[PDB]
């Protein structure tokens, strides 16, 4: 049923009144938890990645009007990055998030672009792909995928089963461009 | 060790004596056959793509010393592009081939040959083309990078650009 199918995303798309200082609190808390879990799980993570694409708000607080939407997007990105860290990757290289129009001074939903980049063995990378696809609390659609190999990856000896030979077995770099769907009031 | 693993690809890497004019003839024949097959199979193909990345030899013949190597590379690229055309894609956008060092008049266990292909089509034909690149038994194409785009941002054409390294096994 479509009602049960969209049940989890409608509840998670509900906005909550938030102040810019509360948003900074959430951002720093999520960043600290992510750095702790990455040091625990042996996942190297740059600072631009650890800021979850909100590095522009590390010092400058966001606008009052964009606080709720930015908080929702931060929740979604944090959940996605934690699902990815649960997959056993080896490095988070980049988490880029273009600024929404509400940040710079009515459709039934709003897309939010995001570009993540990670690096790891083929198994963990495929698990991360499945995690991006299969999240039930936030709807992330895969708009583009880039895959790069390293200088000494041996070719195979002579959807998820199609791009597997296109990845090195030991380490592969993967950059995914996604659109988070935030459901607004339909009418 | 390396022979047993890559055994099927070894036979096609043997070079054959070739003249620059014979290479140009072979190139023009492959280009005509490819354009004919694309017009029949309703697959749009640009002029730069039809030359299979050898457009620099459309008028000027190649060097004598690089003729055999260019013939091998042309055979491999032609087989790959025909395998792709058999998949029912909708467009061949680019087939770019950087010049090999043997071409410019200026002993490794193998020689890599770069190649950049780009095609466009529905998801089914794109997956068929990916499997065709994967499953080639006559020439070893190694995937150096692959990018996939859906054009119109979601929320049915799909663009795929693959950077490959053809492996030439020498004596």
Report on this model:
The structure is a homodimer. In chain A, strands 1-2-3-5-4 form a five-stranded mixed beta sheet. Chain A contains six helices and five strands. Chain A has a single domain (2-183), classed as Ribosomal protein S6/Translation elongation factor EF1B (Alpha-Beta Plaits), CATH 3.30.70. The two termini of chain A are 22 Å apart. Chain A has helices at 2-5, 7-12, 20-40, 47-50, 67-85, 122-134, and strands spanning 44-45, 91-96, 109-120, 140-148, 172-183. Chain A is globular. By secondary structure, chain A is an alpha+beta fold. The longest helix of chain A has 21 residues, at 20-40. The A-B interface holds A 109, 111, 141-149, 155-159, 162-163, 165-167, 179, 181 and B 5-9, 127, 130-131, 134, 137, 140, 142-150, 153-155, 167. Chain B: Keywords: Membrane, Transmembrane, Transmembrane helix.
Any descriptors?
homodimer; 187 residues; alpha+beta; Alpha-Beta Plaits; five-stranded mixed sheet; 6 helices; 5 strands; globular
Brief overview, please?
With 187 residues, chain A is of the alpha+beta class. Chain A has one domain: Ribosomal protein S6/Translation elongation factor EF1B (Alpha-Beta Plaits), CATH 3.30.70. Chain A has helices at residues 2-5, 7-12, 20-40, 47-50, 67-85, 122-134; strands at residues 44-45, 91-96, 109-120, 140-148, 172-183.
């Amino acid at each position: 049923s479509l009602e049960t199918a969209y049940k989890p995303f409608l509840a998670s798309s509900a906005l909550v009144p938030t102040t810019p200082t509360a948003f900074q609190n959430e951002l720093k808390t999520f960043r600290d938890s992510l750095i702790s879990s990455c040091k625990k799980k042996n996942i190297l993570i740059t600072d631009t990645s650890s800021w979850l694409g909100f590095q522009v708000y590390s010092t400058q607080a966001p606008s009052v009007q964009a606080a709720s939407t930015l908080g929702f997007e931060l929740k979604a990105i944090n959940s996605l990055v934690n699902k990815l860290a649960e997959c056993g990757l080896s490095k988070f290289i980049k988490v880029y998030r273009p600024q929404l129009p509400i940040e710079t001074p009515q459709a039934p939903w709003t897309p939010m672009p995001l570009e993540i980049a990670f690096q790891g063995d083929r198994e963990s990378v495929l698990k991360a792909m499945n995690a991006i696809t299969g999240m039930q609390d936030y709807l992330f659609t895969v708009n583009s995928i880039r895959i790069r190999n390293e200088r000494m990856m041996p070719p195979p000896i002579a959807i998820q089963q199609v791009i597997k030979p296109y990845m090195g077995k030991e380490q592969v770099f993967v950059q995914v461009s996604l659109n988070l769907v935030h459901f607004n009031q339909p009418k």
